[PDB]
């Protein structure tokens, strides 16, 4: 049967790591929506946000989500905010197998600390300030993330064994 998977969750959850490994396992291509957006507009997501504003960027993201949703045999990763706008989550649920990569804040904290340089919004935040920031961000996003048809614990993606194990568990959960 035709495969169309959408991965959702916060930055640091492992959408790229698990997504690419899952796609490889299924032998289908992996598409990161942010990458797709940059290819279509020949502008980075940061440039689009500054040029179009929040509302404008979210409209274009929605439109690009609708484009990638027409692809068959693919694993699609979405930006952390995508599920919060329009009917994006409901739309993903209707068009493909939608998974929320649920990751405990202690794990997000560790991962984001290590990847601090790659996440400008976290610059200057340490210990309790950083943890409170993540926890609050998840509070705002959770009502959307939790609408995903499938909820998968993505806490363990820290080596080849863990990634392979996760891929297998996800494949079983999705009945693939």
User: Tell me, what CATH number does 142's domain have?
Assistant: 3.40.50.300
3-state secondary structure of 19: helix
Sheet of 4-8, strand order = 30-32, 74-77, 4-8, 97-102, 150-153
* Kind plus residue range of the DSSP H or E element containing 40: helix 33-41
Residue range of the domain that includes 91: 1-176
Calpha distance 169→153 (Å, rounded): 10
- Return the structure tokens found at 24: 């490889």
The answer to whether the CB of 103 falls within 8 A of the CB of 110 is no
- Return the structure tokens found at 55: 């509302």
User: 53 Cβ partners below 8 Å, 6+ apart?
Assistant: none
Length, in residues, of the chain: 176
How would you write 46-107 as a 3-class SS string?
HHHHHHHHHHHHHHHHHHHHHHHCCCCCEEEECCCCHHHCCCHHHHHHHHCEEEEEECCHHH
Binding residues, as ranges, are: 12-17, 34, 58, 80, 119, 141
The answer to whether the CB of 149 falls within 8 A of the CB of 91 is no
Binding residues for ATP, as ranges, are: 12-17, 119
User: 63 Cβ partners below 8 Å, 6+ apart?
Assistant: none
User: 109 Cβ partners below 8 Å, 6+ apart?
Assistant: 130, 131, 134
Binding residues for substrate, as ranges, are: 34, 58, 80, 141
Binding residues for Mg(2+), as ranges, are: 16
Q: Which residues of 34-58 are buried (b: 16+ CB within 10 A; e: fewer)?
A: bebbbeeeeeebeebeeeeeeeebb
- Measured CA to CA in angstroms, residue 176 lies from 80, 82, 90 at distances of 25, 25, 22
The residues with which 7 forms a beta bridge, in sequence order, are 77, 99
CA atoms within 13 A on the CB side of 37: 25
The answer to whether the CB of 57 falls within 8 A of the CB of 49 is yes
The answer to whether the CB of 77 falls within 8 A of the CB of 33 is yes
Overall number of domains in the chain: 1
């Amino acid at each position: 049967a035709m495969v169309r998977i959408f991965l959702t969750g916060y930055m640091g959850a492992g959408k790229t790591t698990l997504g690419k490994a899952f796609a490889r396992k299924l032998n289908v291509p992996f598409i990161d929506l942010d990458w797709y957006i940059e290819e279509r507009f020949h502008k980075t997501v940061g440039e689009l946000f500054t040029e179009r504003g929040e509302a404008g960027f979210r409209e274009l993201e929605r439109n690009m989500l609708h484009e990638v949703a027409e692809f068959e045999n693919v694993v699609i990763s979405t930006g952390g905010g995508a599920p919060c706008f329009y009917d994006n989550m409901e739309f993903m649920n209707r068009t493909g197998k939608t998974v929320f990569l649920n990751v405990h804040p202690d794990v997000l904290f560790r991962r984001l600390r290590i990847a601090k340089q790659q996440r400008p919004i976290l610059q200057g935040k340490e210990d309790d300030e950083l943890m409170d920031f993540i926890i609050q961000a998840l509070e705002k996003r959770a009502p959307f993330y939790t609408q995903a048809q499938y909820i998968f614990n993505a806490d363990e993606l820290e080596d080849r064994w863990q990634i392979e194990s996760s891929v297998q568990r996800l494949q079983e959960l999705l009945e693939l």
